[model samples]
Target: QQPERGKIYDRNGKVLAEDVERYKLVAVIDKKASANSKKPRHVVDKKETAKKLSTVIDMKPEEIEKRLSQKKAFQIEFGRKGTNLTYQDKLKIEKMNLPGISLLPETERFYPNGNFASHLIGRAQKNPDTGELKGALGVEKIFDSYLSGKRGDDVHLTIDSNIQVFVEEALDGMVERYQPKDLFAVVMDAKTGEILAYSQRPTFNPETGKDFGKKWANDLYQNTYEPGSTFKSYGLAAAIQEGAFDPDKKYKSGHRDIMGSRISDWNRVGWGEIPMSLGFTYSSNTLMMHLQDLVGADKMKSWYERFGFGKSTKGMFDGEAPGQIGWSNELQQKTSSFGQSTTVTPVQMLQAQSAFFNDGNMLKPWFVNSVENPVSKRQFYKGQKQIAGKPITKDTAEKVEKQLDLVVNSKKSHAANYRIDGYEVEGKTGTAQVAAPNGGGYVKGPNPYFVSFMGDAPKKNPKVIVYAGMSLAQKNDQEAYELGVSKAFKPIMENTLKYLNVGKS
Candidate 1:
């Protein structure tokens, strides 16, 4: 009388999550099938039956016998412990051939890919009382009404597992190297907006149903981050569009006074008088502040609005943080110029950066390709490519792309860490501070920062935009180490493009 839950697959038809064949152990106490004198088809000894069953299911023998002792139940099934028996467990039970024990076919939710995109795919589970598998989070939760249909509907995501595997391994490498408290990466089609791969750490395997670290949240959208130098691309693009940016404009790179406080460049000492382009290449804060003064806060705010900040990007799953982009005074304004006093989700950055890669038009990031009901053979929801906004002009986007190219190709650039052989990468590196809990001042520590990289490959004709970031959590272990964002970013970009057969530039 129960319907099997639908399956989830990636773009390449690889199963991500699904329901599998299982068995429920049922005992018949008053069976009438026994015909032989020596062999019985019913439970002749309840203690012996319970003891033997305990070995496979791990239920206490006393509990199984208690259920068997119930005189009113001519036939009874064991509770959760005995239900959802795997093929291996069933095989063991079958070989033992305990009297009156039957393996009743059943189904339950399973994640074949384990924690792969667990937050995005969410989870579906059987209720202890009803055995009805219900969506509790993720895409499963958002589209539960249709997914829990008579025969259940299947969901096909835009993610390519082959691509996801690459991202997953890279993220895994970062964990082993840095052991950061959190990390995330996304690979999206630059021209089309479809997300090819999304993976993060502090995630959990649905099979174990144990981890909810970060509250089962997809860091790509559910959380907001101070984007650091990556935000400079937008600032530069905005300045260029407004006719305020002069790449040759020289600026003092050490520090600049804003309001009452002095904000210094990442490098404590100034690089004398350097052009704005090199400031970007060096990832200098003063250069961004210089642009801020020229572009003005009013124009900057308008550009941010056009980029879709301070608003939700997709109706995708659950827990999306709109991100904050506001400044009240000169200090906030100048600081916001270099990605402070503001925040943006990684997905929002992906969507906005598309403008540079796609020649001025921003595409909304989407993961679900389509949802189909197998019984009806019909797709109810289709996630197609759609434009989000045009935050900059073609010329402005080209100008920004050129700078991005310089950021990666230039030997003096801090973002050169993102480069791979044979590919002309264009991107930015970010290093932003982590805020104190529920208050004003920043967190104090040896590594109280979050580092990131957002960029596209084969700058000549972009195919994919990948963004990756992680918070440095190695507290008090004064060992010499560096941020590992590039460790995750390079592999995701190289392999994702290669998988799509996009030749290097």
Candidate 2:
């Protein structure tokens, strides 16, 4: 009934990507209609199209003929199945007036950013029956109306193309250098929930949405795992909120182990006596468990849920996995304290962590900046402040942010790359072994992580919060973890932050 629509871009301005042109190549069966009977049948050089088609696409000449020779109806489309002709590419075919051959132009949705912030931006899949783009996930799905734009409108968003490029490049490096199974990154405007650039590895370009299985981690909302120590930030805040645990209090790590679990510090060795600050700095699981017990599972569970656990951020995306929690039990509660025995999407972590830099007001994460009617040239949608949740007080958020900074700076043996010169960054490191059915539910090799570092620049007045989550590093192997988080992840994130003018820019 109406013409196809364009797609939504990031917070700044960059073509999220849409079909600027479409190629409709037709091969008619007019072999007898030609005055030259001696001319070759189906004169479009079927052999040539067949031979070169595979180079640009997966279709074979023989298969293309099956449809073209039908003599009933034949239409080749670049966006649809079987036809792989771009706008420019079609012109070449038109030049050769092969009997019954003609090439026309049309348009389709093309994700320009590639798999850049795919999971967050989500995807619009073509409907099987209607052949229309359907929002599969992210902003495309959550705020489909806005992204699709109103009648005659185009969704124009303010996504800094430079920032998107930086994040994509950085993540691309991490995925390659560290050889991670998956990775996701989100750069948020600290003052607002407007996601500037959100992307990750294991992604597939939108053009190949259907067959892009090997590319991205559809797990942003679908998969969940124990986040390891990254959950510690939440615990610290909860304790302070209850007024039951003090940052100055003393505790013993590596000294006391949980009843049924073999949870240990980085070395499985205990710090005989340590203050709470030191405990967070060192990421002491033993101490976190104790704090959880003191805070009470009910209170802690409620706090965690309030912070976006067990619920999706309601992002402008669909299939947002509302991460599950075993918070009902004491053991599960303890493990979750430090981000273990619980799983979440990278975006969820960022949204919950917003309390840290947003002065305790967490907001739903989003991407599309604005929208306008293409026909009328009238504005239809725009970005706005989204308040997620106030999981902690402003004072508690500030204190916890600082505590995390110490952990990343002095506590970790390998955090040199994260040390900013003029700005302060705060974050947490996490490495949890994946469950191996063959190994009796405990993996023996590299750890799969929910590792991340969320920080605000300038320390005094935060601007942007950068979040990065990496998975599948060598486990129990600090060396392997470092390879991913410190060596690979740190440089990428650090460089990206700098590019955003967060640090020594």
Candidate 3:
């Protein structure tokens, strides 16, 4: 028996995927007048039949004639052009009274928003052996058993279709303009941990998934890299939590030597002696390293683990990798303080940021909200808001938020390029040198870095958090790279917050 596959809906009940009736043109090659009579009942007038089909569908008479004239075949189907015929088109062809030509009615999957949230919602195909639809990737694959095998099962995701569209359009625009090697972005509700919008470049069309090559894997959850200056936020948070951080105190900024290794600011020469808060705003690696030394390496590791680093968020997403963490050695500890020697996924970062935005609770980011019976609208399974841990006190989170806001508003902050008018954005920016995949050191060229921004809007009480980044093939044009990341990051953050009625603070 064929099971009726259920629909996939966004948070607002907007249909993303559903089954639609389809018709395939089929032919009975050997048609006899009676049970025992073999009267060579194959289509006698092939040219006339082809002419009739040509007028109703996209197929040309020549093409239809080629299939109709196949000898010794019991049946035939027009391969590409004849598949996926709509009901109205089928009716028109059936009215032609073409002998031996018939419509084979079937149900097929349809994606209304083409290429929208393709990787997250995923796609499905028919199973050759069972003739049942099977989920291929994204939420479709993760919730396959709940969605496809049953007749009345459906999944409702936390993703708002409107927000997803905003993210997709913005990401595509950046891709067209900068032509980066790779890019990743995600928007999440700070309190609920629901993934509002998720997108990446080197994306594919869900309908066909034709470009499912090396880029098919979801980079947001899978790709791990040094988070660069963005990692400074966590160290600062830890310092604040331990009362070792003094916002007004000045620190040596340009560079520092730890365990015989030299660490410098992004610009090499520092901002001289700047306050600890300004050091954060300016994203001084030296400042963070110094603070790490004061806070102690063991204490920092405890906070890192509390923030969901070195461990999986445990959302059970397919291809989700638990990112790599640096060891407690003196060099690794110093480098890790400034976002080197450690690796993290964008989604993991998103989850970790929840602590800074939503009280002190770090939430586990989730996509699908619920799986339900399509007919009764009864939920079979529902996702919950899970607090991964309280990495810091609520007061400490608030203090860090204010410090980040200083970075956003500061004239010299690297994240200034991402500012939006009328909104207080609290975030950090990172530009990490890429490690050579084949050997020991880092990639050095015009575009040998990964640039990223992680922030939230309405900073007083943030409702939305966003993380975006791009890996450049060649590095000279800093403006273009920053533009690429900001263009995609800004719109989604603004629109998502606005749509959720998160007014300017």
Expressed as tens digits, the lDDT of each residue in 1-505 for candidate 3 is: 5678888999899999987878888876666532465544356678888888898778788988888778878788987678778899898987976667789876777889878887788888876345578888887788888787547588888888889988888887777777777777888887788999888888788765567554657877777888877888888899998888899999888988777877898779998888998888877888888887898778888878888898877785786888877975888888888788888888778888888877888898988788999677778889889888888898999898888788778776667778887677778877787777898878777757788888888775778888888887343346654553677778888788778776665
Candidate 2 backbone clash number = 41
Q: What is the RMSD, in Å, between candidate 3 and the native fold over all Cα?
A: 2.9
Structural similarity to truth (TM-score) of each candidate? 0.90, 0.82, 0.91
lDDT of each: 0.82, 0.65, 0.80
Relative to the unseen true structure, what is the Cα RMSD of model 2?
4.3
As a TM-score, model 2 comes out at: 0.82
Cα shift from native, residue 61, model 2 (Å): 8.1
Model 1, which residues run further than 4 Å from truth?
Answer: 26-81, 475-481
Worst lDDT window (10 residues) for model 2? Answer: 73-82
Backbone clashes in model 3, listed as residue pairs: 254-270, 446-474, 446-475, 446-476, 447-474, 447-475
lDDT of each residue in 444-499, candidate 2, tens digit only: 55454445555555453656667666766423345446543544344544555677
Ranking by lDDT: 1, 3, 2
TM-score winner between 2 and 3, please give it.
3
In order of TM-score, best first, we have 3, 1, 2
